[PDB]
Amino acid sequence: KVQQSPESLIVPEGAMSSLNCTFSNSASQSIWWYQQHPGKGPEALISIFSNGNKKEGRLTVYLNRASLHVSLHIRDSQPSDSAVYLCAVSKGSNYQLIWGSGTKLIIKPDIQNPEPAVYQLKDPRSQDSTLCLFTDFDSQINVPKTMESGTFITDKCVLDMKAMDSKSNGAIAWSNQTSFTCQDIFKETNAT
Amino acid sequence: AVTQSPRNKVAVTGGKVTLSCNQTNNHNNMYWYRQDTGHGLRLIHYSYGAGSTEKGDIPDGYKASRPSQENFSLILELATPSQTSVYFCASGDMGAAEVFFGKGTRLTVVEDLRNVTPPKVSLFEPSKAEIANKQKATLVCLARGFFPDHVELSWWVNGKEVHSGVCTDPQAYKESNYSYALSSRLRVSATFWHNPRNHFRCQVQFHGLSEEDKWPEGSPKPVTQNISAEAWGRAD
């Protein structure tokens, strides 16, 4: 039985993403870290056989067979390295892997000039369709959902690209009657 | 390296779903796994070489065959909504403890196929306030009401798939008991958005029914299909 540290990890575009793992057979001969991009299956990212550190790129992995704990740390997390992270353990050549619970690591955009704005955008291809874009809000403001059974908030999104500075961000909301203000009594933490 | 097919699938309770994996490597072990939230992977069964499939951790409602050492096929004789999942195939050897993975099959099992419907894709054009005040322009694509959530969203600026400045919801929102929602933001330069010649298109690819499936309904069949909302750069 192998378990992993957070089910869920979101970090801005610069953090150290730190996932952990836990096997049971202290003697397990090997521990593997597999990455799972959206649209791929697990590709193998990195291996530990011995008790210590193993840097590889901006990765380090540390094992403790007298602590049963393997951990993978990503330094300078990138949009690009957001994926599912499976911690398998090959306790022997002749055994198959025993897989982990997983970890959905995701790299939020990092907003260095917090300039929050509730904008509202409009459906060109007509109707009375509009929605709200809550953009450029700090790396701290949390996001549950809305006030009724006729509204939707969506949490902070997830970047996909290695390079630029205009890497879009924001929550978005929409309602199901034209009555509700695009800046309603928001069920979340807000900051001007 | 390894391939599976179908890559998506809708089934009705009671289905001859057979997923089929092929490793054009030379591996002698072949594995079928499934990934449901809370598990990374659970193995259902595996073949140690052409000939005998053996068993696994979850063999219940699943059988398999290894007619070739380059083809290992999983069958769900009678479907059930518990088999709704994502299915990964692997091919392995004794060269290493490292294994090689197929891209995925998304299988959803429903009681009524009439519920499978393509999304409504809407592209919301940038804000006046946004352009003027922040010199940037976010368009927002939003797809509502689709079932199931076998989709992929992609932006397409002037005929080229784009990734820079695109950020998209990780998972799909259950809008209702069927309709799923998904949103995505494309930010670009106001000077770029004002160019009347730059064409932004948001495309949702949706994977509904296989044409081998029956659809006696008053409406069109929800086959696999792209559905886009487009908009061009305006000036004011």
Author numbering:
A (entry chain A): 3 to 194
B (entry chain B): 1 to 236
What does the paper say about this structure?
MHC class I-related protein 1 (MR1) is a metabolite-presenting molecule that restricts MR1-reactive T cells including mucosal-associated invariant T (MAIT) cells. Recent reports have, in addition, identified non-canonical TRAV1neg MR1-reactive T cells that do not express the TCR or markers characteristic of MAIT cells. We further show the crystal structure of the TCR expressed by Traj33+ T cells expanded in Bcl11b∆iThy mice. The most frequent clone in Bcl11bΔiThy mice accounted for 15% of total αβ T cells and expressed a Trav7-6-Traj33/Trbv13-2-Trbj1-1 TCR (designated as clonotype #1) with identical CDR3α and CDR3β sequences.
Cells expressing clonotype #1 occupied 87% of all Traj33+ T cells in Bcl11bΔiThy mice. Furthermore, the TCRα and β chains of clonotype #1 preferentially paired with each other. Crystal structure of MAIT TCR-MR1-6-FP ternary complex is superposed onto clone #1 TCRαβ heterodimer. We also performed scTCR-RNA-seq on T cells from GF Bcl11bΔiThy mice and did not detect clonotype #1, although this clonotype accumulated in SPF Bcl11bΔiThy mice. We thus reconstituted the expression of clonotype #1 TCRα (Trav7-6-Traj33) and TCRβ (Trbv13-2-Trbj1-1) in a TCRαβ-deficient reporter cell line. Although RF was not recognized by MAIT TCRs (blue), it activated cells expressing the clonotype #1 (red) and this activation was blocked by both Ac-6-FP and anti-MR1 antibody (black). As predicted from its TCR sequence, clonotype #1 did not react with an authentic MAIT cell antigen, 5-OP-RU. These results suggest that non-canonical MR1-reactive T cells recognize metabolites presented by MR1 that are distinct from MAIT cell antigens. CDR3-matched Trav7-6-Traj33 TCRs were identified by bulk TCR sequencing of WT mice; however, such cells exist at low frequency and are not pathogenic.
